[PDB]
Design a protein around this motif. Structure first.
Motif, PDB file in Angstrom:
ATOM      1  N   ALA A 113       0.761  -1.009   0.106  1.00 48.40           N
ATOM      2  CA  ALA A 113       0.032   0.045  -0.055  1.00 48.40           C
ATOM      3  C   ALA A 113       0.910   1.378   0.026  1.00 48.40           C
ATOM      4  CB  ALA A 113      -0.927  -0.130   1.222  1.00 48.40           C
ATOM      5  N   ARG A 114       2.028   1.165   0.656  1.00 47.86           N
ATOM      6  CA  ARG A 114       2.843   2.331   0.396  1.00 47.86           C
ATOM      7  C   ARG A 114       3.350   2.526  -0.847  1.00 47.86           C
ATOM      8  NH1 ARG A 114       7.971   2.011   1.339  1.00 47.86           N
ATOM      9  NH2 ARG A 114       9.352   3.903   1.385  1.00 47.86           N
ATOM     10  N   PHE A 115       3.565   1.303  -1.507  1.00 46.83           N
ATOM     11  CA  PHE A 115       4.010   1.539  -3.153  1.00 46.83           C
ATOM     12  C   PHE A 115       3.180   1.516  -4.147  1.00 46.83           C
ATOM     13  CE2 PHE A 115       8.460   1.527  -3.491  1.00 46.83           C
ATOM     14  CZ  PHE A 115       8.928   1.403  -2.377  1.00 46.83           C
ATOM     15  N   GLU A 116       1.844   1.680  -3.716  1.00 44.24           N
ATOM     16  CA  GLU A 116       0.798   1.530  -4.840  1.00 44.24           C
ATOM     17  C   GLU A 116       0.708   2.646  -5.739  1.00 44.24           C
ATOM     18  OE1 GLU A 116      -3.101   1.237  -3.191  1.00 44.24           O
ATOM     19  OE2 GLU A 116      -2.937  -1.018  -2.708  1.00 44.24           O
ATOM     20  N   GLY A 117       0.627   2.471  -7.020  1.00 38.78           N
ATOM     21  CA  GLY A 117       0.444   3.366  -8.061  1.00 38.78           C
ATOM     22  C   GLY A 117       1.683   3.558  -8.549  1.00 38.78           C
ATOM     23  N   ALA A 118       2.543   2.342  -9.185  1.00 39.31           N
ATOM     24  CA  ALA A 118       3.871   2.426  -9.511  1.00 39.31           C
ATOM     25  C   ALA A 118       4.055   1.906 -11.080  1.00 39.31           C
ATOM     26  CB  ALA A 118       4.801   1.661  -8.581  1.00 39.31           C
ATOM     27  N   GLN A 119       5.032   2.692 -11.552  1.00 41.48           N
ATOM     28  CA  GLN A 119       5.289   2.346 -13.058  1.00 41.48           C
ATOM     29  C   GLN A 119       6.189   1.032 -13.100  1.00 41.48           C
ATOM     30  OE1 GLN A 119       7.016   5.530 -15.345  1.00 41.48           O
ATOM     31  NE2 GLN A 119       7.785   4.175 -17.112  1.00 41.48           N
ATOM     32  N   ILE A 120       5.482  -0.155 -13.205  1.00 38.07           N
ATOM     33  CA  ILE A 120       6.033  -1.420 -13.137  1.00 38.07           C
ATOM     34  C   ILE A 120       6.354  -1.840 -14.484  1.00 38.07           C
ATOM     35  CG2 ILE A 120       4.046  -2.936 -13.095  1.00 38.07           C
ATOM     36  CD1 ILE A 120       5.424  -4.515 -11.219  1.00 38.07           C
ATOM     37  N   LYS A 121       7.475  -2.301 -15.194  1.00 39.77           N
ATOM     38  CA  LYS A 121       7.761  -2.835 -16.477  1.00 39.77           C
ATOM     39  C   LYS A 121       8.315  -4.233 -16.083  1.00 39.77           C
ATOM     40  CE  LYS A 121      11.004  -1.546 -18.937  1.00 39.77           C
ATOM     41  NZ  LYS A 121      12.011  -2.619 -18.547  1.00 39.77           N
ATOM     42  N   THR A 122       7.978  -5.106 -17.228  1.00 40.55           N
ATOM     43  CA  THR A 122       8.636  -6.368 -17.094  1.00 40.55           C
ATOM     44  C   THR A 122       9.838  -6.649 -18.060  1.00 40.55           C
ATOM     45  OG1 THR A 122       7.959  -8.680 -17.294  1.00 40.55           O
ATOM     46  CG2 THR A 122       7.299  -7.262 -18.890  1.00 40.55           C
ATOM     47  N   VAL A 123      10.305  -7.818 -17.885  1.00 44.47           N
ATOM     48  CA  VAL A 123      11.516  -7.846 -18.861  1.00 44.47           C
ATOM     49  C   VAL A 123      11.231  -7.846 -20.231  1.00 44.47           C
ATOM     50  CG1 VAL A 123      12.916  -9.677 -19.593  1.00 44.47           C
ATOM     51  CG2 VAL A 123      12.513  -9.335 -17.275  1.00 44.47           C
ATOM     52  N   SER A 124      10.143  -8.214 -20.716  1.00 44.47           N
ATOM     53  CA  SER A 124       9.674  -8.089 -22.059  1.00 44.47           C
ATOM     54  C   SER A 124       9.446  -6.619 -22.455  1.00 44.47           C
ATOM     55  CB  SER A 124       8.291  -8.701 -22.394  1.00 44.47           C
ATOM     56  OG  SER A 124       8.315 -10.220 -22.149  1.00 44.47           O
ATOM     57  N   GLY A 125       9.285  -5.819 -21.707  1.00 42.79           N
ATOM     58  CA  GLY A 125       9.321  -4.338 -21.778  1.00 42.79           C
ATOM     59  C   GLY A 125       7.856  -3.574 -21.794  1.00 42.79           C
ATOM     60  N   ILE A 126       6.751  -4.214 -21.041  1.00 42.45           N
ATOM     61  CA  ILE A 126       5.542  -3.803 -21.114  1.00 42.45           C
ATOM     62  C   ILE A 126       5.423  -3.101 -19.916  1.00 42.45           C
ATOM     63  CG2 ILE A 126       4.759  -5.833 -22.710  1.00 42.45           C
ATOM     64  CD1 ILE A 126       3.267  -6.867 -20.358  1.00 42.45           C
ATOM     65  N   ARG A 127       4.763  -1.996 -19.851  1.00 50.60           N
ATOM     66  CA  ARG A 127       4.534  -0.990 -18.769  1.00 50.60           C
ATOM     67  C   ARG A 127       3.619  -1.464 -17.814  1.00 50.60           C
ATOM     68  NH1 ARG A 127       6.056   3.109 -22.625  1.00 50.60           N
ATOM     69  NH2 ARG A 127       4.387   2.274 -23.651  1.00 50.60           N
ATOM     70  N   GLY A 128       3.298  -0.861 -16.812  1.00 50.32           N
ATOM     71  CA  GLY A 128       2.373  -1.224 -15.715  1.00 50.32           C
ATOM     72  C   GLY A 128       2.003  -0.092 -14.696  1.00 50.32           C
ATOM     73  N   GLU A 129       1.690  -0.529 -13.443  1.00 48.43           N
ATOM     74  CA  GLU A 129       1.548  -0.067 -12.297  1.00 48.43           C
ATOM     75  C   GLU A 129       1.015  -1.210 -11.167  1.00 48.43           C
ATOM     76  OE1 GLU A 129      -1.654   2.686 -12.362  1.00 48.43           O
ATOM     77  OE2 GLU A 129      -2.980   1.435 -13.073  1.00 48.43           O
ATOM     78  N   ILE A 130       1.033  -0.929 -10.091  1.00 46.08           N
ATOM     79  CA  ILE A 130       0.602  -1.808  -8.936  1.00 46.08           C
ATOM     80  C   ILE A 130      -0.853  -1.243  -8.489  1.00 46.08           C
ATOM     81  CG2 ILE A 130       2.854  -2.611  -8.812  1.00 46.08           C
ATOM     82  CD1 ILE A 130       2.914  -1.297  -5.947  1.00 46.08           C
ATOM     83  N   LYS A 131      -1.848  -1.743  -8.643  1.00 46.97           N
ATOM     84  CA  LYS A 131      -3.242  -1.246  -8.356  1.00 46.97           C
ATOM     85  C   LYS A 131      -3.805  -1.400  -7.111  1.00 46.97           C
ATOM     86  CE  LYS A 131      -5.004  -0.577 -12.744  1.00 46.97           C
ATOM     87  NZ  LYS A 131      -6.404  -0.333 -13.587  1.00 46.97           N
ATOM     88  N   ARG A 132      -3.813  -2.553  -6.388  1.00 48.22           N
ATOM     89  CA  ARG A 132      -4.266  -2.716  -4.951  1.00 48.22           C
ATOM     90  C   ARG A 132      -3.463  -3.867  -4.231  1.00 48.22           C
ATOM     91  NH1 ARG A 132      -9.035   0.300  -2.914  1.00 48.22           N
ATOM     92  NH2 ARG A 132      -9.192  -1.644  -1.318  1.00 48.22           N
ATOM     93  N   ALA A 133      -3.261  -3.587  -3.118  1.00 50.07           N
ATOM     94  CA  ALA A 133      -2.734  -4.707  -2.421  1.00 50.07           C
ATOM     95  C   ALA A 133      -3.743  -5.807  -2.197  1.00 50.07           C
ATOM     96  CB  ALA A 133      -2.152  -4.269  -0.913  1.00 50.07           C
ATOM     97  N   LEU A 134      -3.249  -7.069  -2.483  1.00 50.08           N
ATOM     98  CA  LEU A 134      -3.884  -8.381  -2.489  1.00 50.08           C
ATOM     99  C   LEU A 134      -4.294  -8.507  -0.945  1.00 50.08           C
ATOM    100  CD1 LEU A 134      -5.476  -9.675  -4.609  1.00 50.08           C
ATOM    101  CD2 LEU A 134      -3.952 -11.463  -4.590  1.00 50.08           C
ATOM    102  N   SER A 135      -5.349  -9.167  -0.612  1.00 46.51           N
ATOM    103  CA  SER A 135      -5.642  -9.336   0.536  1.00 46.51           C
ATOM    104  C   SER A 135      -5.265 -10.613   1.438  1.00 46.51           C
ATOM    105  CB  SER A 135      -7.171  -9.247   0.973  1.00 46.51           C
ATOM    106  OG  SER A 135      -7.861 -10.325   0.417  1.00 46.51           O
ATOM    107  N   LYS A 136      -5.726 -11.755   0.834  1.00 42.19           N
ATOM    108  CA  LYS A 136      -5.496 -13.111   1.718  1.00 42.19           C
ATOM    109  C   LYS A 136      -4.010 -13.372   1.978  1.00 42.19           C
ATOM    110  CE  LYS A 136      -5.818 -17.078   0.119  1.00 42.19           C
ATOM    111  NZ  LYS A 136      -4.800 -17.902  -0.482  1.00 42.19           N
ATOM    112  N   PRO A 137      -3.382 -13.571   0.646  1.00 38.60           N
ATOM    113  CA  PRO A 137      -1.926 -13.757   0.803  1.00 38.60           C
ATOM    114  C   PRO A 137      -1.206 -12.472   1.265  1.00 38.60           C
ATOM    115  CG  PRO A 137      -2.812 -14.491  -1.432  1.00 38.60           C
ATOM    116  CD  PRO A 137      -3.733 -13.676  -0.629  1.00 38.60           C
ATOM    117  N   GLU A 138      -0.100 -12.649   1.898  1.00 40.10           N
ATOM    118  CA  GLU A 138       0.373 -11.439   2.850  1.00 40.10           C
ATOM    119  C   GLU A 138       0.851 -10.332   2.077  1.00 40.10           C
ATOM    120  OE1 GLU A 138      -0.337 -11.079   5.604  1.00 40.10           O
ATOM    121  OE2 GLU A 138       0.395  -8.971   5.918  1.00 40.10           O
ATOM    122  N   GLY A 139       1.459 -10.539   0.782  1.00 41.66           N
ATOM    123  CA  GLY A 139       2.111  -9.562   0.256  1.00 41.66           C
ATOM    124  C   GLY A 139       1.825  -9.399  -1.280  1.00 41.66           C
ATOM    125  N   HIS A 140       0.842 -10.231  -1.834  1.00 38.37           N
ATOM    126  CA  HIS A 140       0.769 -10.254  -3.263  1.00 38.37           C
ATOM    127  C   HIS A 140       0.116  -8.986  -3.569  1.00 38.37           C
ATOM    128  CE1 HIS A 140       0.926 -14.963  -3.222  1.00 38.37           C
ATOM    129  NE2 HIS A 140       1.858 -14.482  -2.189  1.00 38.37           N
TER     130      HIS A 140
END
Lengths: 49, 205, 39, 143, 22, 150, 40, 28, 50, 91, 47, 63, 63, 11, 125, 256
Positions: A22-49
């Motif tokens: 939750a501290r890191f939410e809203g981040a330009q995440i990109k993968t090795v293939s080179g496709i951009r992103g963001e981290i939207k919401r902290a998943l609940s039941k697993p601890e960090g996903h």
RNA sequence: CGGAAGGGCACCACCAGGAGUGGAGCCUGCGGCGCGCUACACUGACGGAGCCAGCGAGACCUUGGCCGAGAGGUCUUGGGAAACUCCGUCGUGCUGGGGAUAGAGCAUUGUAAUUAUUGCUCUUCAACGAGGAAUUCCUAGUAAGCGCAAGUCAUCAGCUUGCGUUGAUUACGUCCCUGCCCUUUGUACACACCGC
């Protein structure tokens, strides 16, 4: 990533808690293939996903 | 266009907005509302007489509005269209209520019992169905396919029987006892049926 | 007619319930606060 | 003049064939029929513990013959109803494959069915004839 | 139980640390 | 389609109206088959108890239990009182059915009886005008209030 | 680190006040776009 | 393909509208 | 503490809607004339709530 | 426009408005000559009434409401291929 | 609504009266939100 | 009690009556002459039959 | 609507009033169209009951 | 405030 | 070849193909006799056309109905519509249209939805 | 009728392509326009003549907050009718709308009692805009605030600059009713600030010296993120425009 | 600046009814406010039996075979939903409705801290006895019930949005109240109607 739909993905193994994510939410995440992103919401039941 | 017949002159020229051609007409008993059904729009345009500017566009068909008429007792209107459908509108007093009935094929002529309880609609199979309004149900129909004397064409390649050239009735009207129907179409025959027993009384050529 | 006594104001039951309710409380509070700060 | 379960009702046929299997006896029921649960989604074993296995066998024969070949997994899918996980909404639960397979092996040992290529379980000719016989019996059951 | 309580205290420590940062 | 125009209810068959009104509560909505089963068992029970005719019994009960006068709430600008007026036949029928259905459901809500037999008892006593049925009691109360402050 | 989309603004007294003064200037001018009836 | 299906025009008229394992293979 | 039933039930108003069918409804009025309670109860009917 | 009127009104525009061509683009008949043969054999109708002479320019709305005559072998076979024939309408 | 506003203005330091009408007839205003944004700006500039 | 029947003849509109209650004119079924202005509660239309406990009284407006 | 609403007894009183004006001619000439319109409409509405009643004094009034 | 017609019967 | 007519009935989302041919007088649905429709309270809801019109017609006629889609109730209504339509189509094509009209009149007098679908298209105020 | 729809959608696409080309030619000609010295197509057809009618409908099985918000939107627009959707499929829904004769449709989506998306579709196969609406505050949320004035309202549009801004402005304008009065009381404000157009009702009275405004109606921030050419049933109509999230310059570009 | 008269419209109004929230448990958004899901059973529960859909097509699913009560694991192939209905058991008792929590046991997942998560089974049977003050919402395939599928640049993963299934009761009138809006130069063109 461990569960993917069209344009959405569940990412594991990158943080250690929901407070952390939750501290890191809203981040330009990109993968090795080179496709951009963001981290939207902290998943609940697993601890960090 | 609304004409007098004591001074012999137009009152008025009702019209739409896009200069749209009008196939069928009906008028309220009180002479206060005028309804016209086009073929390029399939909306029943409704004008007021004394004011002149069109009230509204009763919409709800799809495909051209074949015919209209008013029940002159409850003062309703039935509007029938090539949507294989009849639509009974009550358009007075706060409600604006509709009632859609289905026939088996393209209605294209309509008339109404003088008492104002039933509609008689001729479709393209050539069956004159007859409906009760308040119940919106089918009191009974009269086949017409065989008792029609069509005509052959000298430029045709087929017969005068096995062609549906005019195998239907484009014009219906009741009698004023409500017991008989006159029917005529693009065919060579004028057939006189009667409602309550579903048969033909006469056929003129 | 038998009388009855009303209570008004299990031990480890209430203790685990209290600890979980507390933890829920500060967890939701801290998630709220961190998210606001990050935005 | 030649009838079938296609012409007979379902429940009456199942009850009649289950009674026939009770009276015939040679079905080789398993030893734990009175403890087994029939579904993980169920919550108490069948009430009529004396012949519910026979009712299952008859229903299986009817299902196979109305169909043509069916696996134990297909049987489990067919039989397994939905559960009630409580506060959370429900989700679909399969049946007891173990019971389905003791039913299936018992029917093979009896000879009602035969094996089916492409993998599968088909109805045998003799079983089909006996099924028609019992269907006619329950049709003219009305005397 | 006890592990839950002590990690709870540690996370409250984390909270106050974030706020003395902020 | 009996809800489009204004009196297609009056054109509905009375039994179907009864079953529809029966299938009315939170856990009851949308089980018309079960409502039909209930009405069937109820009719059977009516014949078993009284031999005459289930449907005649139903019709007689409805006609007997529909109220006849009722009091509207005149505000009077704050002096809230009741005024007695008549009631149209369609309202009489609607209320008769509603009274019977609610009576059966109420009398079999928490009781060893079941809905089918309780409905049979309700209908039979209503045809009798027994004054021991919920419906007849309520009708009498409404009409008494009307009689009082007419 | 770096974001990836504009953050949704928070409405505060300052911005709502600027908005309201702007509306007032508009209507005091009586200049404000509408959907005017087509003539002729 | 979806666009074509949405505009099928359900009245089109083409004219052609008017028409062991090894042992079984060998027989067929 | 017996966990058998709710004892003090705050109910939806009003009293008539949560009241028996056949009833006599009186109010204690100081200026009203004096009546006898036992004779009043006996002169009331048989299946009533007061 | 008006220069549209002076330039693009062509014998091509009129002839593509011609009925059998309308049948072909709207896909009644695979070829112009098959379309004309069908008009001769009397299988098409525009609105209520059917059409026998190909040199029949179809108005906008009417060409939108073109289709076959009922109970013709052509429609019967079309529906047969679709396996959607329905003899109640004596299609 | 509008009736209340018109009555209030007809009834009614003129600048202050205008300001109080402002602040009472804008009924959608996060005072804790405003103080929070203040303390967050303060934290940012201190940072 | 002796009750009477009546047939509605006209619903009377535009009178300012309390919502839900409706004015109406009835003529008695037994004798076709005499007519009374009553009030009704449910949905009512012309030419149906209506039951009166009273014949003497005639409805007034209900504010 | 008012002339429809008013009940038959008041209709009868109305006719008495009309006779009174006919005695007092000048009012009649002052408001001739109004009284004619109201009288005729009230009769056209309550015809059935009016003719059904028998009253010799009413015959004289109408004459 | 009465209604037209109502005032009529009164007068 | 053999006289055959084919019709369709349609409730909400239920389709029913009805095949009618001249035969010994059997009515089968999904390979089973019509006397075994599922909901078992609407057995008469589907028996309707037979008892409406009589049965000797069905004694000369053979009927086969295949249903797919919809619920129990929708399937039942589709079945009854398919039977009614198919019966009238057959009487129109192979026997007198006098009897065609008597059949159609009896069906529409009893309940018109036997013949024409009740397409419940919406209403916005 | 389906053939009517096919022909009419094809011609509509043709018209839109021609309008785009003519727009580019006009932009070229603008250089000459300053050397020597207009509404869109559907709304030109029916601009001031026919007053639009809208159907404002919920997504599906709406929670009471979503129903509250739908009613609030209705009270905001004039010539609005609210619709509860239960078991309407989209095709027959829009078919009923076209057949009934309806200028346009507004379908609202919410996330557990908090509205988040709003779709505006124009039915003569016109455009459908998809907005995301965030910072909602309802009158039911607030208080008994009296009643909505319901008069034909004046309009405010602020800081709509590019052709995209013009497109959105015309869509909203022709949702609203045409031809208000001079002293028309309530006014609907559509401010723009960094792509987040925000809307508010205001009643007002021109005071003895100036003006004073009482803010009423909902209060929310709503931002476009799609604008499809076809109608909302289609989902395969060409996109006139499309907000891009994962571009390098995402957090700076305006009107994109 | 104010008043009067006339007319219209509305589930923010009348009228008839339906369904909620608010009580309890659970979930979670705003910071106490608010939204979802499960209960309080007999129109049920339980057990056998019956089977009827539609949207959806970028080391993976799997048909079939083998064992295991279950969960599950093992060997082979290719790139058909619930509510529902039929019989049977249970009976009015917080009981069989309700399964919180607790204990024990059985397997799967990663991994190595005897770490955590998941699923099955036994035993344990709590609150909840239809939810006050109030209050919102609603007119036809509508309220409400039931399941299924996808996550297609925003928003959503104890949730959004679609699709199928079952399907009502009561208004469909009225300006009486609560509001809101319009009109008080017929403007236009016969007839009639009206007339500061």
């Amino acid at each position: 990533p461990y569960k993917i739909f069209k344009n959405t993905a569940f990412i594991k193994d990158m943080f250690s808690s929901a407070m952390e994510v939750a501290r890191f939410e809203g981040a330009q995440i990109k993968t090795v293939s080179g496709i951009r992103g963001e981290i939207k919401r902290a998943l609940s039941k697993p601890e960090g996903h | 266009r609304a004409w007098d017949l004591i001074r012999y002159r137009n009152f008025r020229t009702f019209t739409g907005t896009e200069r749209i051609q009008f196939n069928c007409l009906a008028v309220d008993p009180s002479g206060e509302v005028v309804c016209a059904g086009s073929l390029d729009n399939f909306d029943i345009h409704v004008w007021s007489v004394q004011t002149g500017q069109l009230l509204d566009a009763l919409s709800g068909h799809e495909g051209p509005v074949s015919c209209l008429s008013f029940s002159q007792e409850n003062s309703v209107l039935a509007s029938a269209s090539w949507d294989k459908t009849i639509r009974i509108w009550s358009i007075f007093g706060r409600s604006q209520q509709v009632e859609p009935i289905e026939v088996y094929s393209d209605v294209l002529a309509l008339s109404m019992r003088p008492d104002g309880k039933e509609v008689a609609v001729s479709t393209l199979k050539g069956q004159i169905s007859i409906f009760n309004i308040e119940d919106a149900k089918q009191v009974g129909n009269i086949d017409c396919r065989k008792d029609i004397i069509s005509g052959r064409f000298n430029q045709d390649r087929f017969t005068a029987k096995n062609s549906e050239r005019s195998k239907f009735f484009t014009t219906i009207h009741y009698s004023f006892d409500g017991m008989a129907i006159v029917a005529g179409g693009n065919n060579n025959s004028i057939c006189l049926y009667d409602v309550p027993n579903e048969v033909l009384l006469k056929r003129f050529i | 007619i038998p009388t009855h006594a009303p209570k008004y104001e299990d031990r480890t039951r209430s203790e685990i319930n209290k600890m979980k309710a507390q933890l829920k409380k500060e967890r939701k509070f801290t998630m709220k606060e961190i998210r606001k700060d990050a935005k | 003049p030649g009838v079938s379960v296609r012409d007979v009702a379902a429940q009456d046929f199942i009850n009649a064939y289950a009674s026939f299997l009770q009276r015939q006896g040679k079905l080789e029921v398993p030893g734990y029929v009175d403890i087994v649960k029939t579904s993980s989604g169920n919550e108490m074993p069948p009430q009529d513990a004396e012949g519910w296995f026979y009712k299952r066998a008859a229903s299986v024969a009817r299902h196979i013959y109305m169909r043509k070949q069916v696996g134990v997994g297909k049987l489990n899918k067919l039989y397994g109803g939905a559960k009630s996980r409580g506060v959370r909404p429900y989700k679909h639960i399969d049946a007891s494959g173990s019971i389905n397979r003791k039913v299936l092996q018992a029917l093979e040992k009896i000879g009602i069915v035969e094996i089916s290529p492409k993998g599968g379980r088909r109805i045998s000719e003799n079983g089909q004839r006996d099924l028609d016989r019992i269907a006619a019996q329950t049709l003219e059951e009305d005397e | 139980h006890t592990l839950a309580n002590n990690v709870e205290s540690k996370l409250r420590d984390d909270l106050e640390r974030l706020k003395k940062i902020r | 389609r009996y809800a489009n125009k204004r009196f297609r209810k009056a054109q509905c068959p009375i039994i179907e109206r009864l079953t529809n009104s029966l299938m009315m509560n939170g856990r009851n909505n949308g089980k018309k088959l079960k409502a039909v089963r209930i009405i069937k068992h109820t009719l059977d029970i009516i014949n078993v108890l009284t031999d005459q005719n289930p449907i005649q019994v139903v019709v007689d009960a409805i006609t007997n239990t529909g109220p006849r006068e009722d009091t509207t709430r005149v505000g009077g600008g704050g002096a809230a009182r009741r005024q007695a007026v008549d009631v149209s036949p369609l309202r009489r029928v609607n209320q008769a059915i509603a009274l019977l259905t609610i009576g059966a459901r109420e009398a079999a809500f928490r009781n060893i009886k079941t809905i089918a037999e309780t409905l049979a008892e309700e209908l039979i006593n209503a045809a009798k005008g027994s004054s021991t049925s919920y419906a007849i009691k309520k009708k009498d109360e409404l009409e008494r209030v009307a009689k009082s402050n007419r | 680190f770096d974001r990836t989309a504009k953050p949704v603004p928070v409405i505060t007294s300052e911005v709502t006040e600027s908005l309201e003064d702007m509306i007032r200037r508009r209507i005091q001018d009586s200049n404000f776009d509408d959907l005017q009836r087509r003539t002729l | 393909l979806r666009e074509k299906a949405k505009e099928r025009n359900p009245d089109e008229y083409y004219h052609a509208m008017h028409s062991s394992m090894d042992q079984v293979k060998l027989l067929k | 503490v017996n966990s058998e039933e709710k004892l003090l039930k705050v109910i939806k108003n009003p009293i008539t809607d949560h009241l028996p069918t056949k009833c006599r409804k009186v109010t204690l009025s100081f200026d009203a004339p004096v009546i006898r309670v036992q004779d009043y109860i006996e002169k009331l009917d048989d299946d009533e709530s007061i | 426009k008006i220069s549209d009127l002076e330039n693009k009104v062509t014998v091509s525009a009129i002839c593509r408005r011609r009925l059998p061509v309308i049948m072909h683009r709207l896909k009644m008949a695979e070829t112009i000559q098959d379309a004309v043969k069908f008009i001769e054999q009397g299988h098409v109708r525009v609105g209520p009434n059917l059409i026998n002479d190909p040199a029949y320019l179809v108005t906008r709305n009417m060409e939108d409401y073109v289709t076959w005559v009922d109970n013709s072998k052509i429609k019967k076979t079309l529906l047969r291929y679709r396996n959607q024939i329905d003899d109640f309408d004596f299609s | 609504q509008l009736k209340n506003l018109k009555a209030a203005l007809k009834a009614r330091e003129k600048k202050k009266a205008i300001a109080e009408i402002r602040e009472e007839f804008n009924p959608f205003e996060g005072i804790s939100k405003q103080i929070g944004e203040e303390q967050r700006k303060r934290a940012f500039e201190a940072r | 009690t002796p009750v009477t029947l009546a047939k509605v003849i006209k619903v009377l509109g535009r009178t300012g009556s309390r919502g839900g209650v409706t004015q109406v004119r009835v003529e008695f079924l037994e004798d076709t002459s005499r007519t009374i202005v009553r009030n009704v509660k449910g949905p009512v239309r012309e030419n149906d039959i209506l039951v009166l406990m009273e014949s003497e009284r005639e409805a007034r407006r209900l504010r | 609507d008012a002339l429809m609403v008013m009940p038959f007894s008041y209709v009868l009183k109305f006719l008495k009033f009309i006779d009174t004006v006919m005695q007092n001619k000048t009012l009649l000439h002052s408001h001739l169209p109004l009284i004619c319109k109201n009288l005729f409409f009230i009769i056209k509405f309550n015809h059935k009951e009016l003719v059904s009643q028998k009253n010799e004094e009413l015959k004289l009034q109408i004459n | 405030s009465l209604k037209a017609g109502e005032r009529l019967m009164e007068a | 070849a053999v006289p055959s007519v084919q019709t369709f009935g349609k409730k909400k989302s239920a389709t029913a193909v009805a095949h009618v041919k001249a035969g010994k007088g059997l009515i089968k649905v999904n390979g089973s006799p019509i006397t075994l429709v599922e909901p078992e309270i609407l057995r008469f809801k589907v028996y309707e056309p037979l008892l409406l019109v009589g049965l000797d017609k069905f004694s000369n006629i053979d009927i086969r109905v295949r249903v797919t889609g919809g619920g129990h109730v929708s399937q039942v209504y589709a079945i009854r519509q398919a039977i009614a339509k198919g019966l009238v189509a057959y009487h129109q094509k192979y026997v007198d249209e006098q009897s065609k009209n008597e059949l159609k009149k009896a069906f529409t007098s009893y309940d018109r939805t036997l013949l024409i679908a009740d397409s419940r298209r919406p209403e916005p105020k | 009728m389906l053939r009517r729809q096919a022909r009419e959608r094809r011609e509509y696409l043709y018209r839109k392509a021609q309008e785009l080309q003519d727009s580019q030619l006009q932009q070229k000609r603008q250089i000459i326009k300053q050397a020597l010295a207009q509404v869109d197509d559907e709304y030109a057809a029916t601009s001031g003549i026919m007053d639009p009618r809208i159907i404002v409908t919920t997504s599906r099985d709406p929670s009471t907050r979503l129903s509250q918000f739908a009613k609030e939107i209705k009270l905001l627009f004039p010539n609005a009718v609210r619709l509860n959707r239960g078991n309407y499929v989209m095709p027959n829904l829009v078919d009923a709308c076209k057949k009934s004769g309806t200028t346009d449709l507004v379908v609202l989506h919410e996330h557990r009692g908090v509205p988040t998306s709003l779709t505006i579709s124009h039915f003569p196969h016109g455009p459908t805009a998809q907005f995301s609406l965030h910072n909602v505050v309802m009158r039911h949320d607030i208080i008994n605030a009296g009643n909505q004035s319901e008069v034909n309202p004046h309009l405010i549009f602020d800081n709509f600059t590019t052709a995209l801004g013009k497109r959105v402005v015309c869509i909203l304008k022709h949702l609203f009713n045409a031809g208000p009065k001079k002293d028309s009381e309530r006014v609907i404000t559509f401010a723009n600030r960094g792509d987040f157009i925000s809307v508010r009702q205001h009643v007002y009275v021109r005071t003895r010296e100036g003006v004073e405004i009482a803010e009423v109606g909902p209060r929310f921030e709503m931002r476009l993120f799609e604008l499809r050419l076809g109608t909302l049933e289609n989902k395969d109509a060409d996109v006139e425009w499309q907000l891009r999230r994962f571009i390098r310059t995402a957090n700076k570009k305006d009107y994109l």
